[PDB]
Amino acid sequence: KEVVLLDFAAAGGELGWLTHPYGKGWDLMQNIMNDMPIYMYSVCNVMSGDQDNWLRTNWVYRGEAERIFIELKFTVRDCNSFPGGASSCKETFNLYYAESDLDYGTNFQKRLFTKIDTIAPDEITVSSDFEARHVKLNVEERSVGPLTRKGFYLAFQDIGACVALLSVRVYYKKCPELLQGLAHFPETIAGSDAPSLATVAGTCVDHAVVPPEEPRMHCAVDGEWLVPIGQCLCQAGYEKVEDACQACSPGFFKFEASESPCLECPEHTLPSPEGATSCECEEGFFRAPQDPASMPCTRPPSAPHYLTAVGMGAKVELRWTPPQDSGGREDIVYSVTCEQCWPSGECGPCEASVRYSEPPHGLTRTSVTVSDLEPHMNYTFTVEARNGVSGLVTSRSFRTASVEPPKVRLEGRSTSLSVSWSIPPPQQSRVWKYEVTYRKKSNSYNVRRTEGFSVTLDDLAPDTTYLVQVQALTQGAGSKVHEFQTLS
Amino acid sequence: VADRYAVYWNSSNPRFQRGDYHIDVCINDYLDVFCPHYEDSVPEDKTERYVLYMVNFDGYSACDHTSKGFKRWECNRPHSPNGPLKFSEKFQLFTPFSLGFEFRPGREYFYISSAIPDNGRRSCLKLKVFVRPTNSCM
């Protein structure tokens, strides 16, 4: 943006500039142009030989100006258009300037002034331009710097030309007040040196902050802000609306300082007030200290839907399933505990002699093997399900599970094998059917079924070892493998 | 007079009330037109305002600038600061500026005025300038 220090055309002819020599050179003329009253300094001593006429402007307070720009508007008359026209006619005039600490007033010494440049017209005014009322107004601009003293003059030297000065405009350039990157940059003065890049620190607008680079701009000599470094961010609870930061709307939130808008409240949450960093949880639900506020409120899971405790051999196998209700979480872990009971009646916690095929806590698997158990003892295993928000409630979600084969003998043989078995009468009600399996002593065996307690394996090979097992089926428990040999 | 000729352009001036106001000048002499000036204690109704035109005879004689004149000055500030608004004309031979006004020895030039609030455009205030021949000017 340009700050004007001098504007002749705007002064309405009230400036009264100093001329030299006294009342000989430039004159203040007045005319009408564009139906408007205008003033101008003009001189046309084209017949008088060696001319040296000076027009000095009033003392101009420099202020903070380093490089000033001088805009001249003027006309120059064709040297050919003079009935007489001595070879002393010129078509240029000179632009001078002088720095000063104080106003010399009526004092004028030429050799104080330094020449800036020769001013020449792009358009010459010809004689025909005269009966046609045609004004050819030239525009010329120069610049000088660095200005260093309190003030300065401008001076115009005529050397024998036909000129009229319509406008004189002096100004310096000012990098405009700036709102960018959510920061504020004051109006600063364009330096004088061409390679001038003044670093201007910015101020974070209200409710803005620098999170981790601090905002900076660079003012050039032409008044342009060049290279932006860093920025201010709409911090938590705030977002970017147009050129500033605004509090999050009701029902929205923002947890960090980012260039993202406010996220609307997730599921199972309570409507938020303005400028919320996170939405509060709905009754009965929670969030973990690692959950993003975009994640819906969750809760502890239900118990493992199913749990089976089978005593295959001497070890017991625990096989379970994920809860019907996960509480809307995916970080579910399991933990197993044990109680002992002597069918004595007395009970107590599991002994330290019981081992697990896997550390009984922090389980992600849905099964574990328990070994080293005392016989006949009634073991009750409880498997608990826990997710990320379990530590925020006292309740527990778990499921419990507590942990005679046929005695078989040969009643005869031939070549075939006549087999019989037995189980205590109290158990006889439980068995639906008995399953007899017989293989030859790798992938092909034969199985029959009976509700009775004896079967005769038929169609067998002579002098042969067979693997016979009898399992008690229920709506179970199988015997050990027996080796029975046929006759010869 | 001397070198500058002051002309107070208002209907109260006896010079204009005689209807034959004219000045004999030489090249490089000046014409200083002083517009009507009133203090702030005037309802601006008796205040006089004019548009001044440079015209020929028939325009001069008929008080008509139409097709015979250039609009020259405008007395539109009856309350200017430093005394009356002033316009100046230098009777120069050659103009420094494109299309400035040039004057020749032994020639006559004419200025007429038309009231801004308009009175009737009848008998306008007028001025004849006679630029004396070189023989007469010293």
Swiss-Prot record, chain A:
Mode of membrane association: Single-pass type I membrane protein
Gene Ontology biological process terms from the UniProt entry: activation of GTPase activity; angiogenesis; axial mesoderm formation; blood vessel endothelial cell proliferation involved in sprouting angiogenesis; bone remodeling; branching involved in mammary gland duct morphogenesis; cAMP metabolic process; cell adhesion
Record's keyword terms, sorted: Angiogenesis, Apoptosis, ATP-binding, Cataract, Cell adhesion, Cell junction, Cell membrane, Cell projection, Differentiation, Disease variant, Disulfide bond, Glycoprotein, Host cell receptor for virus entry, Host-virus interaction, Kinase, Membrane, Nucleotide-binding, Phosphoprotein, Receptor, Repeat, Signal, Transferase, Transmembrane, Transmembrane helix, Tyrosine-protein kinase, Ubl conjugation
Keyword Nucleotide-binding carried by entry: yes
Region Mediates interaction with CLDN4: start-end pairs: 1-180
Reactions accelerated catalytically: L-tyrosyl-[protein] + ATP = O-phospho-L-tyrosyl-[protein] + ADP + H(+)
Reported modifications of this chain: Autophosphorylates. Phosphorylated on tyrosine upon binding and activation by EFNA1. These phosphorylated residues are critical for recruitment of VAV2 and VAV3 and PI3-kinase p85 subunit which transduce downstream signaling to activate RAC1 GTPase and cell migration.
Molecular functions (GO terms): ATP binding; cadherin binding; ephrin receptor activity; growth factor binding; molecular function activator activity; transmembrane receptor protein tyrosine kinase activity; virus receptor activity
Cystine residue pairs: C44-C162, C79-C89
Known glycosylation sites: N378
Extracellular side of membrane: 1-488
Domain Eph LBD positions: 2-180
EC number: 2.7.10.1
Tissues expressing this chain: Expressed in brain and glioma tissue and glioma cell lines (at protein level). Expressed most highly in tissues that contain a high proportion of epithelial cells, e.g. skin, intestine, lung, and ovary.
UniProt entry tagged with the keyword ATP-binding: yes
Oligomer status and interactors: Homodimer. Interacts with SLA. Interacts (phosphorylated form) with VAV2, VAV3 and PI3-kinase p85 subunit (PIK3R1, PIK3R2 or PIK3R3); critical for the EFNA1-induced activation of RAC1 which stimulates cell migration. Interacts with INPPL1; regulates activated EPHA2 endocytosis and degradation. Interacts (inactivated form) with PTK2/FAK1 and interacts (EFNA1 ligand-activated form) with PTPN11; regulates integrin-mediated adhesion. Interacts with ARHGEF16, DOCK4 and ELMO2; mediates ligand-independent activation of RAC1 which stimulates cell migration.
Protein name (Swiss-Prot/TrEMBL): Ephrin type-A receptor 2
Species annotation: Homo sapiens
Organismal lineage: Eukaryota, Metazoa, Chordata, Craniata, Vertebrata
Residues represented out of the complete protein: 27 to 528 of 976
Swiss-Prot record, chain B:
GO cellular component terms, semicolon-separated: adherens junction; basement membrane; caveola; external side of plasma membrane; GABA-ergic synapse; plasma membrane
GO terms, molecular function: chemorepellent activity; ephrin receptor binding; neurotrophin TRKA receptor binding; neurotrophin TRKB receptor binding; neurotrophin TRKC receptor binding; transmembrane receptor protein tyrosine kinase activator activity
Keywords assigned: Cell membrane, Developmental protein, Differentiation, Disulfide bond, Glycoprotein, GPI-anchor, Lipoprotein, Membrane, Neurogenesis, Signal
One GO BP: regulation of cell morphogenesis
Subcellular location(s) per record: Cell membrane; Membrane, Caveola
Domain of life: Eukaryota
Residues linked to a glycan: N10
Membrane topology reported for the UniProt record: Lipid-anchor; GPI-anchor
Disulfide bonds: C35-C75, C63-C124
Domain Ephrin RBD: 2-135
Family named by the database record: Belongs to the ephrin family.
Function recorded in the entry: Cell surface GPI-bound ligand for Eph receptors, a family of receptor tyrosine kinases which are crucial for migration, repulsion and adhesion during neuronal, vascular and epithelial development. Binds promiscuously Eph receptors residing on adjacent cells, leading to contact-dependent bidirectional signaling into neighboring cells. The signaling pathway downstream of the receptor is referred to as forward signaling while the signaling pathway downstream of the ephrin ligand is referred to as reverse signaling.
UniProt subunit comment: Binds to EPHB2. Interacts with EPHA8; activates EPHA8. Binds to the receptor tyrosine kinases EPHA2, EPHA3 and EPHB1. Forms a ternary EFNA5-EPHA3-ADAM10 complex mediating EFNA5 extracellular domain shedding by ADAM10 which regulates the EFNA5-EPHA3 complex internalization and function.
Name of the protein in its database record: Ephrin-A5
Species of provenance: Homo sapiens (Human)
Residues of the full protein shown: 28 to 165 of 228
